[PDB]
């Protein structure tokens, strides 16, 4: 697909030190990010409806942590598997009955809380920019795959 | 609204010199951005349908320039007016019959081509990071307002 070629290209184009630091950010903070994501998303009245028990909370947080690491640590050979995952998540969101714009709001929250983590790192400003750029484009590409399903 | 408070907060949190350079990038390069946006979007078969004549092309490019400048140059007192703008655009997209994932794809294209423009500026790496961050968050918050229709 066209999305596969873009995602693959994005990963292939990124230099090893940048992909390495993107993976570092993900692994180091995915747990924190998943917790903050849930807290902020819960505030939204239209989103709070879908989060009504500790089992859902536990499952979503673990799933979000896994998602963040998988996307940001993506290798070229992971792309095809990553694409199928987005389809799977879309199916689940569809069955639960979660509106696309509610999911999009989730992506915005994620991209929002990801930045201070990269900003507070000890990387150079040039490194922070490229890591954040790689991260944003990766998340947006994943969002498009998920929503176009 | 909660959306107004979020957009307001985003502008309030970004230091004046950073928002200033974001506005500078927008005005100086809105023309390039609108043209390249149109070219890339046209490649998508599902989006090419909505762009079938020179009158629409011409008006859309002009509309995009204004949109980019308005969003990236957002002041606190502009937030309320900007929200109404996104609603208006949403109405137009709805009447024409443009799918949400097609619009979302447009936003991804815009964010994608914005980065090399910021990267190519003569600002410091630290400035580029903060300008790019403000820009991404601004475009994303605007997209959510639009998609929430
Ligand atoms: C307001 C936004 C969102 C809400 C309310 C929401 C809600 C949910 C819920 C309730 C589940 C099932 C939990 C369970 O199994 O008990 C789920 C599944 C999942 N979500 Fe979302 N979601 C949102 C957005 C997102 C975003 C932005 C991502 C990734 C960037 C994401 C990734 C996933 C994953 C990986 C799963 C599990 C997939 C599976 O079980 O096969 N979600 N979501
Ligand atoms: C694939 C993506 C998109 C397609 C195919 C598309 C298509 C169109 C078309 C055909 C029009 C009619 C313009 C006219 O006839 O005068 C329009 C209006 C407009 N679009 Fe979109 N659009 C897309 C995404 C976007 C995005 C991402 C933005 C902003 C970030 C945007 C902003 C606007 C604005 C400001 C107008 C005119 C508003 C008005 O007339 O009041 N569009 N769009």
UniProtKB/Swiss-Prot annotation, chains A, B:
The record marks 55 as: Important for oxygen binding and stability of the Fe(II)-O(2) complex. The record marks 60 as: Critical for restricting water access to the heme distal side to avoid rapid autoxidation. Disruption phenotype: Disruption results in a 2.5-fold reduction in surface adhesion, a 3.5-fold reduction in biofilm formation, a large reduction in curli production, a drastic decrease in csgB expression (400-fold reduction in aerobic growth) and in an approximately 3.5-fold reduction in pgaA transcript levels in comparison with wild-type. The record marks 38 as: Involved in oxygen binding and important for the stability of the Fe(II)-O(2) complex. Changing residue 93 to A: Same biofilm formation activity as wild-type. Loss of heme-binding ability. Changing residue 55 to L: Same biofilm formation activity as wild-type. 5-fold reduction in O(2) dissociation rate constant. Significant decrease in the autoxidation rate constant. Heme binds at residue 93. Induction: By RpoS in the late exponential growth phase and upon entry into stationary phase. Expression is higher at 28 than 37 degrees Celsius. In rich medium DosC and DgcM are the major RpoS-dependent GGDEF-domain containing proteins in the cell, whereas in minimal medium it is the major RpoS-dependent GGDEF-domain containing protein. Highly expressed on solid medium. A member of the dosCP operon. Forms a complex with DosP. Is composed of an N-terminal sensory globin-fold domain that binds heme and oxygen, and a C-terminal GGDEF diguanylate cyclase domain. Globin-coupled heme-based oxygen sensor protein displaying diguanylate cyclase (DGC) activity in response to oxygen availability. Thus, catalyzes the synthesis of cyclic diguanylate (c-di-GMP) via the condensation of 2 GTP molecules. Is involved in the modulation of intracellular c-di-GMP levels, in association with DosP which catalyzes the degradation of c-di-GMP (PDE activity). Cyclic-di-GMP is a second messenger which controls cell surface-associated traits in bacteria. Overexpression leads to an increased level of c-di-GMP, which leads to changes in the cell surface, to abnormal cell division, increased biofilm formation and decreased swimming (the latter 2 in strain W3110). In a strain able to produce cellulose (strain TOB1, a fecal isolate) overexpression leads to an increase in cellulose production. This is Diguanylate cyclase DosC. The lineage of its organism: Bacteria, Pseudomonadati, Pseudomonadota, Gammaproteobacteria, Enterobacterales. The chain holds residues 8 to 154 of 460 of the full protein.
């Amino acid at each position: 697909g066209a999305m596969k070629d873009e995602w693959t290209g994005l990963v292939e184009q990124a230099d090893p030190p940048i992909r390495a630091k993107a993976a570092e950010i993900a692994v180091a903070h995915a747990h924190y990010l998943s917790i903050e994501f849930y807290r902020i998303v819960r505030i939204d009245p239209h989103a709070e409806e879908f989060l009504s028990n500790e089992q859902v909370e536990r499952q979503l947080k673990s799933a979000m942590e896994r998602w963040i690491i998988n996307v940001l640590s993506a290798q070229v050979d992971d792309v095809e598997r990553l694409i199928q995952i987005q389809h799977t998540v879309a199916e689940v969101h569809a069955r639960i009955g979660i509106p696309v714009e509610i999911v999009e709001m989730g992506f915005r929250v994620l991209k929002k809380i990801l930045y201070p983590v990269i900003f507070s790192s000890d990387y150079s400003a040039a490194e922070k920019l490229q890591v954040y750029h790689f991260s944003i484009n990766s998340i947006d590409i994943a969002m498009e795959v998920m929503t176009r399903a």
